[PDB]
PDB file of N, CA, C and O and ligand atoms in Angstrom:
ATOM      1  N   UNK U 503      18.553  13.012 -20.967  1.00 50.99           N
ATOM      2  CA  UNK U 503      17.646  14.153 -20.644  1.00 50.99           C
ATOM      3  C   UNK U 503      16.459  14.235 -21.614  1.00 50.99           C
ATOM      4  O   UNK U 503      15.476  14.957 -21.448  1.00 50.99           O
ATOM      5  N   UNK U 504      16.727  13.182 -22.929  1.00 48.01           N
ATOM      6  CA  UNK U 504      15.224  13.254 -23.644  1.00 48.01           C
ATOM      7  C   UNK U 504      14.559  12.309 -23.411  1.00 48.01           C
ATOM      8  O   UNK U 504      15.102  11.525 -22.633  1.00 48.01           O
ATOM      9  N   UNK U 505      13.162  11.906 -23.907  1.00 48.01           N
ATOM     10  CA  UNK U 505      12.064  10.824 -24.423  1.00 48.01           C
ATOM     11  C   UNK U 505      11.748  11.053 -25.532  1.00 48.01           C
ATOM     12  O   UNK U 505      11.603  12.141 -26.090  1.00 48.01           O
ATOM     13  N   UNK U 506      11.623  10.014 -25.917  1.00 52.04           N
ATOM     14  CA  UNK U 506      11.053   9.325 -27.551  1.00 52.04           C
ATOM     15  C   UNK U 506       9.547   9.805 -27.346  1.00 52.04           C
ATOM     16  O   UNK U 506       8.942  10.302 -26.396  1.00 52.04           O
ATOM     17  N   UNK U 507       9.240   9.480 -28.508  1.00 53.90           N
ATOM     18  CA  UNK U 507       8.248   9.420 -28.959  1.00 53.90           C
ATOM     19  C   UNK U 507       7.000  10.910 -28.261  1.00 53.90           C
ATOM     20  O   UNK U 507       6.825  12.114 -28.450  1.00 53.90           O
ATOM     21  N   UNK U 508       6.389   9.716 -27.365  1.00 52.32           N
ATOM     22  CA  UNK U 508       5.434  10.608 -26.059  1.00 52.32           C
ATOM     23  C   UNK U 508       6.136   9.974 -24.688  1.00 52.32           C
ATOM     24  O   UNK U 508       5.417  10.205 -23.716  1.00 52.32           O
ATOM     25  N   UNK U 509       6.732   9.611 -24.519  1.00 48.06           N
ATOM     26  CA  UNK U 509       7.658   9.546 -23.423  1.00 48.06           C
ATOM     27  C   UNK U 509       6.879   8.171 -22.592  1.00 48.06           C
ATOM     28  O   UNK U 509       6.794   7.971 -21.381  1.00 48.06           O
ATOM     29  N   UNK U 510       6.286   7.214 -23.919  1.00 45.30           N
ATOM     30  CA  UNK U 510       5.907   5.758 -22.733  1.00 45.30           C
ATOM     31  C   UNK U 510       6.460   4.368 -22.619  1.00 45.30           C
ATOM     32  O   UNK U 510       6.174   3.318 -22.043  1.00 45.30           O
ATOM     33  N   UNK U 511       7.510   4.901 -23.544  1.00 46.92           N
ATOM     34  CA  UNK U 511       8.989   3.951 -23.196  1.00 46.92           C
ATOM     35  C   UNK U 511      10.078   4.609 -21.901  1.00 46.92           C
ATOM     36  O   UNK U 511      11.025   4.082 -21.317  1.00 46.92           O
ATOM     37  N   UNK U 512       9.481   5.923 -21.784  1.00 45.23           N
ATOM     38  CA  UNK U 512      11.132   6.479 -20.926  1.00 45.23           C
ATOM     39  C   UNK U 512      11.345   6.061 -19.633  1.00 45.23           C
ATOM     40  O   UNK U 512      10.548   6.303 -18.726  1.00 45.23           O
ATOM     41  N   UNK U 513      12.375   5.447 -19.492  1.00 51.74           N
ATOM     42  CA  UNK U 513      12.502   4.567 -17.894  1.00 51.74           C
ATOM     43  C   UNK U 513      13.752   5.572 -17.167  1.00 51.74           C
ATOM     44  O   UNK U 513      14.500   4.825 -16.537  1.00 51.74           O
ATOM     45  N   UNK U 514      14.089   6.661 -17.089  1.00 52.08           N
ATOM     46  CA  UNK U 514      14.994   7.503 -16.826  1.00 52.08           C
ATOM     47  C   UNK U 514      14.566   7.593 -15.132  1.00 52.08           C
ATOM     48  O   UNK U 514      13.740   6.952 -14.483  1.00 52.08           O
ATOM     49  N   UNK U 515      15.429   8.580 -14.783  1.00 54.07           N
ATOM     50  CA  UNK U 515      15.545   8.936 -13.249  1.00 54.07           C
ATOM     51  C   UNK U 515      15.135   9.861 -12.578  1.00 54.07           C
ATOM     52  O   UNK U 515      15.056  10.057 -11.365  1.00 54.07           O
ATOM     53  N   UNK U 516      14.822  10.546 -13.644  1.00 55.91           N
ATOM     54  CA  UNK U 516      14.143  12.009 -13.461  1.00 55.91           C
ATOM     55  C   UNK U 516      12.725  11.973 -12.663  1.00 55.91           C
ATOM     56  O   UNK U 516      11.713  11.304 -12.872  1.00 55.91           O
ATOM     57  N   UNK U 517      13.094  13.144 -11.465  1.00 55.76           N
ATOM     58  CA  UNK U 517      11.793  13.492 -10.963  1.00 55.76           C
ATOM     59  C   UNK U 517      11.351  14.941 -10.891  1.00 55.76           C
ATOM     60  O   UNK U 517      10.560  15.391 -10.062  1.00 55.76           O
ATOM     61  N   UNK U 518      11.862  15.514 -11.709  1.00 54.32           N
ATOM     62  CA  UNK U 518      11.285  16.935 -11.462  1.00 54.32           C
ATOM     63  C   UNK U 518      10.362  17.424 -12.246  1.00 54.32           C
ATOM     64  O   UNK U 518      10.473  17.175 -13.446  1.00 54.32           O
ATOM     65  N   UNK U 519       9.345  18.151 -11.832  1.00 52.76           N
ATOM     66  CA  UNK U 519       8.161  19.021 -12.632  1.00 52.76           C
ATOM     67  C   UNK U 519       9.000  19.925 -13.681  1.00 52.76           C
ATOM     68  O   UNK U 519      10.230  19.915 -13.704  1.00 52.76           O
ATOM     69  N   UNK U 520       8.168  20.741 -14.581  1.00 55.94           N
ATOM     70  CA  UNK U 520       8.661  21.641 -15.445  1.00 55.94           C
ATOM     71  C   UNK U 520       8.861  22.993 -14.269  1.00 55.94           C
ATOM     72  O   UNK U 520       9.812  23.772 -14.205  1.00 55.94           O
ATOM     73  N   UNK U 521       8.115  22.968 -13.748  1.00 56.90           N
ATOM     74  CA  UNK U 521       8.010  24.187 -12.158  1.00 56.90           C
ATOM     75  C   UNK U 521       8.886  24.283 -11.436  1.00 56.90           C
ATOM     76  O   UNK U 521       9.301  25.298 -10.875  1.00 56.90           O
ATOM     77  N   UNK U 522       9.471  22.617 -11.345  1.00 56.72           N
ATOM     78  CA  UNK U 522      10.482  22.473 -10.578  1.00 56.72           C
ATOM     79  C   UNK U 522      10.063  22.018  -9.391  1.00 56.72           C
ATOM     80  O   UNK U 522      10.830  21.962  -8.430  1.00 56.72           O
ATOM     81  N   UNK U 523       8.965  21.693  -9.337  1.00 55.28           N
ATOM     82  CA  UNK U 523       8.391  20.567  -8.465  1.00 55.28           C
ATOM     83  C   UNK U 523       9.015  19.559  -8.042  1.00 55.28           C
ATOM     84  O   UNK U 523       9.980  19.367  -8.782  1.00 55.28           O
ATOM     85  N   UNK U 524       8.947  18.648  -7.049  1.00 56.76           N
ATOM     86  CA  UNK U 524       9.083  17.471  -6.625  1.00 56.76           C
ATOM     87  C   UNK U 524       7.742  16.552  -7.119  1.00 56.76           C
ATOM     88  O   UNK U 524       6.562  16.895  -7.054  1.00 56.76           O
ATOM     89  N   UNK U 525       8.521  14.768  -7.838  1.00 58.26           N
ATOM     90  CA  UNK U 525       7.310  13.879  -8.231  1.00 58.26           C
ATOM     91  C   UNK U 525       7.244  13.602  -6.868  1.00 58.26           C
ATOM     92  O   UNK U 525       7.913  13.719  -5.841  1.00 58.26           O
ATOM     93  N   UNK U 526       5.516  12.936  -7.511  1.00 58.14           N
ATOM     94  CA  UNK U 526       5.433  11.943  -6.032  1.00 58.14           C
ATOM     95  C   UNK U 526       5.806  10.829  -6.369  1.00 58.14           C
ATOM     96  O   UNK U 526       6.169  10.528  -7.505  1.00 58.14           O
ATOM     97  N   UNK U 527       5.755  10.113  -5.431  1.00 57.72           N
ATOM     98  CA  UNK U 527       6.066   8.289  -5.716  1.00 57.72           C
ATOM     99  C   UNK U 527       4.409   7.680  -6.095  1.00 57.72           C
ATOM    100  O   UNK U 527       3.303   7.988  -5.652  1.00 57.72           O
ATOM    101  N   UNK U 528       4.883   6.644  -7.166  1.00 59.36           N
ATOM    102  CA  UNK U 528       3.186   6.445  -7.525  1.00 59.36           C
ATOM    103  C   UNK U 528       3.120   5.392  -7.038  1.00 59.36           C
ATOM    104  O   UNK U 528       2.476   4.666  -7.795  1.00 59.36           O
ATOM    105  N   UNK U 529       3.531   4.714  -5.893  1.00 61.90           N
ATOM    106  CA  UNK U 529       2.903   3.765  -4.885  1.00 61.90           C
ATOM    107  C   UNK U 529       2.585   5.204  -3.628  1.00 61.90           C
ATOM    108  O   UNK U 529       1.649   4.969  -2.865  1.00 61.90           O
ATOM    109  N   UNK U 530       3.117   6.225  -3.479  1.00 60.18           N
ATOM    110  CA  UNK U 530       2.133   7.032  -2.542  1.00 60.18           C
ATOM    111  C   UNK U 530       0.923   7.281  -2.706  1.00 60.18           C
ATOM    112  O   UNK U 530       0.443   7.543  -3.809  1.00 60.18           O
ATOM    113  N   UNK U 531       0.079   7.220  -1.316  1.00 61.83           N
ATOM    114  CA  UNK U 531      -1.027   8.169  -1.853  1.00 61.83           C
ATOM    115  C   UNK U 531      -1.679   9.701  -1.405  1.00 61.83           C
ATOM    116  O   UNK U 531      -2.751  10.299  -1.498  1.00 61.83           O
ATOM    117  N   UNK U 532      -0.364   9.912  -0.885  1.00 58.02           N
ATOM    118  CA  UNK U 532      -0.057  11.312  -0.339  1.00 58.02           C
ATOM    119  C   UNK U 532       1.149  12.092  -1.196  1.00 58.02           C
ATOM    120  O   UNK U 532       2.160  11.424  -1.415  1.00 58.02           O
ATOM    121  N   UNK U 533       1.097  13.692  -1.777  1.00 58.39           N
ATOM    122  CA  UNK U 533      -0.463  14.578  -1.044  1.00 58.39           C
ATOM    123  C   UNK U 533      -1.530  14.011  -1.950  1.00 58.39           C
ATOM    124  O   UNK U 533      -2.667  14.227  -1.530  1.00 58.39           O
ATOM    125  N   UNK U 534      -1.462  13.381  -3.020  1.00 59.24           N
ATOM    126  CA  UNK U 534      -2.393  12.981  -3.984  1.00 59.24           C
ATOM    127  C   UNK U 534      -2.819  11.493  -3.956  1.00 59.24           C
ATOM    128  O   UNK U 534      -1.994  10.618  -4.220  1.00 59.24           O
ATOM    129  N   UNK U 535      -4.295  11.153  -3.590  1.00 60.71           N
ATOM    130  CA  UNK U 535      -4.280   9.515  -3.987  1.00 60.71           C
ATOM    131  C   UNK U 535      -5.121   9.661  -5.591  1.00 60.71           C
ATOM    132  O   UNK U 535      -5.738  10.427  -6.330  1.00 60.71           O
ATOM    133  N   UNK U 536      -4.788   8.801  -5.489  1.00 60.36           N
ATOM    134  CA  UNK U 536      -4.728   8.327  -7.452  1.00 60.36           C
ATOM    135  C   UNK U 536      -4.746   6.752  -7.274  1.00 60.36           C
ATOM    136  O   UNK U 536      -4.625   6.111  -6.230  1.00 60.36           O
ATOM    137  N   UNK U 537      -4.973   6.192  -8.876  1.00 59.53           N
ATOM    138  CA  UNK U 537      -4.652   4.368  -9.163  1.00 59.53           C
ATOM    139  C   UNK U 537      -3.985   4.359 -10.506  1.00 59.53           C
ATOM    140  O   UNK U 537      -4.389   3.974 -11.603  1.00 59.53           O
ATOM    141  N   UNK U 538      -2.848   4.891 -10.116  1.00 61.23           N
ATOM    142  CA  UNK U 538      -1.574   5.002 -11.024  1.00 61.23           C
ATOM    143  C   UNK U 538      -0.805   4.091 -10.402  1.00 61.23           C
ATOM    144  O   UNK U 538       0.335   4.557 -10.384  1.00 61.23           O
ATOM    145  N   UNK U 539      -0.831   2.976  -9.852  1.00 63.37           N
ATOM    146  CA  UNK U 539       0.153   2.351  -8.539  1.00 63.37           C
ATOM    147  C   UNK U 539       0.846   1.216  -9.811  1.00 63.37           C
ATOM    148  O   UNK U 539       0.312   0.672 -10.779  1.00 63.37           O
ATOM    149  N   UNK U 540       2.310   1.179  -9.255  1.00 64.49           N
ATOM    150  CA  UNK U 540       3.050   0.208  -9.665  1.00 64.49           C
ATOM    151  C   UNK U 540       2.115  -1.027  -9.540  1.00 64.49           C
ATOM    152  O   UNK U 540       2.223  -1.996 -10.291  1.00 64.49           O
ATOM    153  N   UNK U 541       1.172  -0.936  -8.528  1.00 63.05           N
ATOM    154  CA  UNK U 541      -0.331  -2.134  -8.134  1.00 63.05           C
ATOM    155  C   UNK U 541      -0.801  -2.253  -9.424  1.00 63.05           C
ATOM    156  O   UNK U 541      -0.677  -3.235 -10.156  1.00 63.05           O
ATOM    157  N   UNK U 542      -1.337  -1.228  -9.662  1.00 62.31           N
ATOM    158  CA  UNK U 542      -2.556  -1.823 -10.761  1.00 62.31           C
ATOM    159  C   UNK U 542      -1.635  -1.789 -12.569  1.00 62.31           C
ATOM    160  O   UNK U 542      -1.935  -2.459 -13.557  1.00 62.31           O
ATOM    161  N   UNK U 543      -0.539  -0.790 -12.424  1.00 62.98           N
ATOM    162  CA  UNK U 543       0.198  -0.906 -13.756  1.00 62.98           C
ATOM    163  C   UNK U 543       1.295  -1.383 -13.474  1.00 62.98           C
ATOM    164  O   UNK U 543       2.303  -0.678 -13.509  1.00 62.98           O
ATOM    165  N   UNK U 544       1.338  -2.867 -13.087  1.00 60.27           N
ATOM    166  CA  UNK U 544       3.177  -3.294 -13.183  1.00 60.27           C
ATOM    167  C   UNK U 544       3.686  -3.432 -13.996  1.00 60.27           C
ATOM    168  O   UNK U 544       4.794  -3.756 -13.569  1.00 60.27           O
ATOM    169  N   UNK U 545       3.745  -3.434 -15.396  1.00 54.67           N
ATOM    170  CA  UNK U 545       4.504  -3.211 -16.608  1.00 54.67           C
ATOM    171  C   UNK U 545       5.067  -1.497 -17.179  1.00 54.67           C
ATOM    172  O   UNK U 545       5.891  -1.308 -18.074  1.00 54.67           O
ATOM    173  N   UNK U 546       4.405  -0.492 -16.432  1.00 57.76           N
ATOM    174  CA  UNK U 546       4.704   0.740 -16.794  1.00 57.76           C
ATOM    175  C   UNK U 546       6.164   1.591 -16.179  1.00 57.76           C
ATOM    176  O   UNK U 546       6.754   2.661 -16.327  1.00 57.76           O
ATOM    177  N   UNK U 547       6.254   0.408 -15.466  1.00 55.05           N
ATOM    178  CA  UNK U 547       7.899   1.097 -14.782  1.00 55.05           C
ATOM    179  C   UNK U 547       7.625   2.080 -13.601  1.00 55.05           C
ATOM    180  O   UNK U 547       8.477   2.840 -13.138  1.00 55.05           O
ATOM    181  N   UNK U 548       6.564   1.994 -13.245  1.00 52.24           N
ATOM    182  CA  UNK U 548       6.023   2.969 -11.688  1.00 52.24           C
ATOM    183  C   UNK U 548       6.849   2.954 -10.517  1.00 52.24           C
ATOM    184  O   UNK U 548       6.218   2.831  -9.467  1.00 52.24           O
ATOM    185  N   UNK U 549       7.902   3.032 -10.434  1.00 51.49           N
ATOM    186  CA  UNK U 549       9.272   2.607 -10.033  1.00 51.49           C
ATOM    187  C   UNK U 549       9.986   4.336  -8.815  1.00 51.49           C
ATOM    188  O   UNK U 549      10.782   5.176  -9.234  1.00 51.49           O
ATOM    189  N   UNK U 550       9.578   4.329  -7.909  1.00 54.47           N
ATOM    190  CA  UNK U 550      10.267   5.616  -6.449  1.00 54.47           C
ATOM    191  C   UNK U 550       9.354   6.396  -7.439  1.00 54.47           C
ATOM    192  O   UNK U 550       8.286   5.953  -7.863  1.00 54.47           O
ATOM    193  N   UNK U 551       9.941   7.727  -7.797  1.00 53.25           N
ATOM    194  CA  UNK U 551       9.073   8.761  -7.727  1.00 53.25           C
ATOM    195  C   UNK U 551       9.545   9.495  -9.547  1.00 53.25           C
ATOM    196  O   UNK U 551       9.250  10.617  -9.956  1.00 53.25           O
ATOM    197  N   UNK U 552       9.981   8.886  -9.971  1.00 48.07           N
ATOM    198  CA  UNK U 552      10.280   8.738 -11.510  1.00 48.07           C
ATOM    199  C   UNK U 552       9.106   9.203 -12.273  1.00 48.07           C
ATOM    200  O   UNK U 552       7.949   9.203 -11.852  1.00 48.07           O
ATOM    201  N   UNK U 553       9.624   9.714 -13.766  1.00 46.35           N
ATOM    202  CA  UNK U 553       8.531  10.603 -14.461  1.00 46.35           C
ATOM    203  C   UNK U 553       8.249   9.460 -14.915  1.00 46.35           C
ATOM    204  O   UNK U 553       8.860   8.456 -14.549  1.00 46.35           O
ATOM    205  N   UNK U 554       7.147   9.435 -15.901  1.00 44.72           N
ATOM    206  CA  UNK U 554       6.896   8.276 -16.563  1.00 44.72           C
ATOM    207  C   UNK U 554       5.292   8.946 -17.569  1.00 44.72           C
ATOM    208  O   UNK U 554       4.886  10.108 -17.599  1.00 44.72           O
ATOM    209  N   UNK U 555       4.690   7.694 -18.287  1.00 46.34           N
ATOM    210  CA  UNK U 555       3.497   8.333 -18.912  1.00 46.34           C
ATOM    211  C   UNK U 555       2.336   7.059 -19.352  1.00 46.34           C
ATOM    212  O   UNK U 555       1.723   6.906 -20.409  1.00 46.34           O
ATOM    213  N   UNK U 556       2.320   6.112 -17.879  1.00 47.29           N
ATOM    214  CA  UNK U 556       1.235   5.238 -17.922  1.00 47.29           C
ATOM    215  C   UNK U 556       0.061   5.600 -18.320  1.00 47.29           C
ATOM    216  O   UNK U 556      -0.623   4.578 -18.275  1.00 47.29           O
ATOM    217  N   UNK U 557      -0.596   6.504 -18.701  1.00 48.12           N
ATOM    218  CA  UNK U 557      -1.574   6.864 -19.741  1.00 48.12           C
ATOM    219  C   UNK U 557      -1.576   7.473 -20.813  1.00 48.12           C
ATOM    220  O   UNK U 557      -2.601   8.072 -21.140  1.00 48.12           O
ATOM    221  N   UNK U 558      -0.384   7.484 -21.684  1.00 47.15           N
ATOM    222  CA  UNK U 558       0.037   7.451 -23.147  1.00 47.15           C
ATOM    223  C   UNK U 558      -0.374   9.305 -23.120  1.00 47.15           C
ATOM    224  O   UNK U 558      -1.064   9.840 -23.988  1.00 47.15           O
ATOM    225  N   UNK U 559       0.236  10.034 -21.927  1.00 46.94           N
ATOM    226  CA  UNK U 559       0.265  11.570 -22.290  1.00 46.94           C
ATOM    227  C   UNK U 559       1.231  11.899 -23.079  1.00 46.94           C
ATOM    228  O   UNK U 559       1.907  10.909 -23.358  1.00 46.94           O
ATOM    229  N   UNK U 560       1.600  12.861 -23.566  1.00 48.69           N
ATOM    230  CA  UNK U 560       2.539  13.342 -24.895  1.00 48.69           C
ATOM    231  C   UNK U 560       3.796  13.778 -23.900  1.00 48.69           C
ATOM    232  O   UNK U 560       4.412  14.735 -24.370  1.00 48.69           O
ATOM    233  N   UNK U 561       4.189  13.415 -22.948  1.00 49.96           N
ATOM    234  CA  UNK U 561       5.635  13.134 -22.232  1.00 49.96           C
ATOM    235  C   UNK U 561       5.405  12.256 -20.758  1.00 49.96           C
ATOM    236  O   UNK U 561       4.547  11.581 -20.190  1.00 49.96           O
ATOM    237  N   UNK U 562       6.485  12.652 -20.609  1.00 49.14           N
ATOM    238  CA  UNK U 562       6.495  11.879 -18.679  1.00 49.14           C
ATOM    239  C   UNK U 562       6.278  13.130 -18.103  1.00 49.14           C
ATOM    240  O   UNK U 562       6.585  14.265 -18.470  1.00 49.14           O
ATOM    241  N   UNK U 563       5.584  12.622 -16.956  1.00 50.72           N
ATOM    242  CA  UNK U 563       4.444  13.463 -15.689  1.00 50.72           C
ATOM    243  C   UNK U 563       4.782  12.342 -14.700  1.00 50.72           C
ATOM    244  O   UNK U 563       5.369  11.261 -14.661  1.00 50.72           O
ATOM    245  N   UNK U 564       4.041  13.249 -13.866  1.00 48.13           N
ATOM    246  CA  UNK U 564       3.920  12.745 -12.409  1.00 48.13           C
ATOM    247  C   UNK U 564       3.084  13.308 -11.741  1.00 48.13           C
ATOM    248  O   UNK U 564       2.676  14.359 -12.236  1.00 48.13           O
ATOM    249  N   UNK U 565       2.453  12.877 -10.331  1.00 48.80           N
ATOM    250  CA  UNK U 565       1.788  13.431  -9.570  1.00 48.80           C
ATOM    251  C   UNK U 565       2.587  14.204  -8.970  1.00 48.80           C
ATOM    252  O   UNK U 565       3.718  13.880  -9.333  1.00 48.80           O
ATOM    253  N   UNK U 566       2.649  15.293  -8.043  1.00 49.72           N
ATOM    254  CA  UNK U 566       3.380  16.491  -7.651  1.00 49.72           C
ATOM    255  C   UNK U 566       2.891  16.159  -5.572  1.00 49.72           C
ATOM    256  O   UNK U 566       1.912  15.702  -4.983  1.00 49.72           O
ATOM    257  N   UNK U 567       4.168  16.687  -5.185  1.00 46.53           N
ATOM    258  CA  UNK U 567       4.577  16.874  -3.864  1.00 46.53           C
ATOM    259  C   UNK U 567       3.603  18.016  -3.393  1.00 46.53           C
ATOM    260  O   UNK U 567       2.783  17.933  -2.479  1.00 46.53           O
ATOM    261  N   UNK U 568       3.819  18.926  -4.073  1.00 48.07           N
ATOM    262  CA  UNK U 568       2.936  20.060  -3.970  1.00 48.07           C
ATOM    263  C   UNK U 568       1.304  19.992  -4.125  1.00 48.07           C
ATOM    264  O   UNK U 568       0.680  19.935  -5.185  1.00 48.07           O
ATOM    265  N   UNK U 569       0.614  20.017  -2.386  1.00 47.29           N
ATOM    266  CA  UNK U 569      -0.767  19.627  -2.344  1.00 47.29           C
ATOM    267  C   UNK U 569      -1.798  20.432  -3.414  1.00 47.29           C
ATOM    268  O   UNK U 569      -2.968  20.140  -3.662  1.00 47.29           O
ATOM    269  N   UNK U 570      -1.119  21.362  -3.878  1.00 43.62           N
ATOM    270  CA  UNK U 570      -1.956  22.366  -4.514  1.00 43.62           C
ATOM    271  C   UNK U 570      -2.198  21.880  -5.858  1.00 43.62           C
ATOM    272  O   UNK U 570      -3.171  22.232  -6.525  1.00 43.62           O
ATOM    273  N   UNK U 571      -1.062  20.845  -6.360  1.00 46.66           N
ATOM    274  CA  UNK U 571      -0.512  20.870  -7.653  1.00 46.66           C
ATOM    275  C   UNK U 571      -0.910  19.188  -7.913  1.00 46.66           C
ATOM    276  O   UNK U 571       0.056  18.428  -7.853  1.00 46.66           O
ATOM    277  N   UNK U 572      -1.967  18.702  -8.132  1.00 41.58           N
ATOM    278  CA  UNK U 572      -1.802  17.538  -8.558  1.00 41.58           C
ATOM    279  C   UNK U 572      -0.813  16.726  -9.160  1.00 41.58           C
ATOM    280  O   UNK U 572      -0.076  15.945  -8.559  1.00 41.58           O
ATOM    281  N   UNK U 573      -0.834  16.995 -10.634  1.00 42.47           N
ATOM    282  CA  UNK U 573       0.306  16.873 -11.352  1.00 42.47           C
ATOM    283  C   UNK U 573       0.967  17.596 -12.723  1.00 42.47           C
ATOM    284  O   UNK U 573       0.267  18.178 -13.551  1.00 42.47           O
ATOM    285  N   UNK U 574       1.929  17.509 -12.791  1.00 43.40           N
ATOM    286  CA  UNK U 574       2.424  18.214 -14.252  1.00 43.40           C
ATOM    287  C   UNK U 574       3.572  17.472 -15.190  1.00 43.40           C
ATOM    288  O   UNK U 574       4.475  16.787 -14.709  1.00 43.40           O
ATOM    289  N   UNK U 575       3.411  17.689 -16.440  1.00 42.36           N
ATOM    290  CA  UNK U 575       4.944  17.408 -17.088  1.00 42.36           C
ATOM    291  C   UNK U 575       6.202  17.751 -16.233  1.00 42.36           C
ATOM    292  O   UNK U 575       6.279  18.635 -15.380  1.00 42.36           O
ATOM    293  N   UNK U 576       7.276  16.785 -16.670  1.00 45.45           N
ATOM    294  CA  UNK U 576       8.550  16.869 -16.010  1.00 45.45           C
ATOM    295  C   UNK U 576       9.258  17.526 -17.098  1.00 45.45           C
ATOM    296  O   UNK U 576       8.794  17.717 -18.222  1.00 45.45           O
ATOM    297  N   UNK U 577      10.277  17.818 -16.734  1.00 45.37           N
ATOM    298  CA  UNK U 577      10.869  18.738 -17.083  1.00 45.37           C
ATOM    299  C   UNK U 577      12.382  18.352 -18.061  1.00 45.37           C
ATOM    300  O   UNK U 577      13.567  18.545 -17.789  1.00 45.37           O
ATOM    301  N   UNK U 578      11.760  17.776 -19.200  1.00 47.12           N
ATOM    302  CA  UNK U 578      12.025  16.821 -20.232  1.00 47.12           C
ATOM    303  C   UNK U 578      12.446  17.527 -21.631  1.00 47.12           C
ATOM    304  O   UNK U 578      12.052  18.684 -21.770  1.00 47.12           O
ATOM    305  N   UNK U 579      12.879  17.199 -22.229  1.00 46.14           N
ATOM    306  CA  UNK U 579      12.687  17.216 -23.842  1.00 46.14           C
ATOM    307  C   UNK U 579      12.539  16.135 -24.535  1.00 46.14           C
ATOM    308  O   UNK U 579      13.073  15.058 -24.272  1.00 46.14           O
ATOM    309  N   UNK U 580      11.795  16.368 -25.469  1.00 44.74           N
ATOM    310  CA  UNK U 580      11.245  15.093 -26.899  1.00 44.74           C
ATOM    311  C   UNK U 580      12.699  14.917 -27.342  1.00 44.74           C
ATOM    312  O   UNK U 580      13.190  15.958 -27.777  1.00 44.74           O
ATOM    313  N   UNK U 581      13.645  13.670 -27.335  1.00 45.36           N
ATOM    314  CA  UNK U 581      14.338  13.550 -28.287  1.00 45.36           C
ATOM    315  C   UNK U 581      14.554  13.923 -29.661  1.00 45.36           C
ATOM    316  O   UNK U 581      15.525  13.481 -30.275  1.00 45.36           O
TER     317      UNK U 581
HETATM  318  N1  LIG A1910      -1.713  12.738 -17.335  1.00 44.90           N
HETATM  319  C1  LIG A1910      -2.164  13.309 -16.015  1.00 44.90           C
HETATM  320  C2  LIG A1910      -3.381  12.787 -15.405  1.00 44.90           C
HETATM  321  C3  LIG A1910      -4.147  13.494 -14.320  1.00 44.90           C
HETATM  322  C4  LIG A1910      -5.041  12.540 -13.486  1.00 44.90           C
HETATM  323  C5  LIG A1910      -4.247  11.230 -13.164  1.00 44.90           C
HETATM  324  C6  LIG A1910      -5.120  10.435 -12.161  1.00 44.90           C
HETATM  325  O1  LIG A1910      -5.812  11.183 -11.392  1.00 44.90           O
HETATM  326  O2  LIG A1910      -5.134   9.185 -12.263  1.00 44.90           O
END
């Protein structure tokens, strides 16, 4: 249930927002398109709909299910 550091090693299973959101999948590009794609970062673990932090944010995020809601931190703790 934690991540190291800023969370850009964490390969966990987790998909939920801090809100309690649903992630999106970052090969979707619905409700959000973005170029976060397992495409253009295949070393970042962009893997179903998993938190993660391919741009070195201070935890794992995701894009959000919720059209309103781009994206937010998941709902994590810092080790
Ligand atoms: N760390 C969250 C980033 C928000 C924008 C991501 C993107 O639009 O590629």
């Amino acid at each position: 249930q934690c991540y190291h550091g800023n969370g850009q090693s964490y390969r966990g299973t987790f998909s939920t927002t801090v809100t309690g959101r649903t992630c999106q999948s970052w090969s979707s590009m619905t409700p959000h398109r973005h170029q976060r794609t397992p495409e253009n970062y295949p070393n970042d673990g962009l893997t179903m709909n998993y938190c993660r932090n391919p741009d070195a944010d201070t935890g794992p995020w995701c894009f959000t299910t919720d059209p309103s809601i781009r994206w937010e931190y998941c709902n994590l703790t810092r080790c």
